[PDB]
């Protein structure tokens, strides 16, 4: 009579990371963007695409 | 005329072993056991399971 089961309870810390990157836009691209957002009979399809 | 068959009869002792292990139980487990042995409308199913 010397034996007895034993259990272990380990717990962990989660830590923490992130993400980030650079992505720049030209103003003329935004201008052609604005018309294409309301795509209609106007707005040159070739330049928009 | 000198040849003759010969036989050998070996017999074995079977020896003897056994097994034993420890397994403890808490009184609260037995108490919740008692209600589950008579499982009815009472006796919390979640705690019993």
Question: Dihedral, CA atoms, B38, B41, B47, B49, nearest 10 degrees?
Answer: 60
**Alpha helices (H) in B1-49, listed in sequence order:** 27-37, 45-48
Contacts of A4 in chain B (CB under 8 A): 22, 24
| Integer Cα distance of B33 and B30 in angstroms | 5
Burial of B43 (0-12, 13-18, 19+ CB in 10 A): middle
| PDB resolution in Å | 4.0
Distance of CA B42 to the CA centre of its chain: 33
Q: CB within 8 A of A3, min separation 6: which ones?
A: B21, B22
Pick among B21, B22, B25 to test the A interface (most A CBs inside 10 A):
B22
Contact A4 B24 (CB under 8 A): yes
Rounded Cα–Cα distance for residues A28 and A47 (Å): 11
């Amino acid at each position: 009579p010397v034996d007895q089961p034993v259990h272990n309870y380990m717990v962990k810390r989660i830590h923490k990371r992130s993400l980030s990157a650079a992505f720049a836009i030209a103003s003329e691209a935004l201008s052609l963007l604005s018309n294409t957002y309301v795509a209609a009979t106007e707005i040159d399809s070739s330049l928009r695409i």
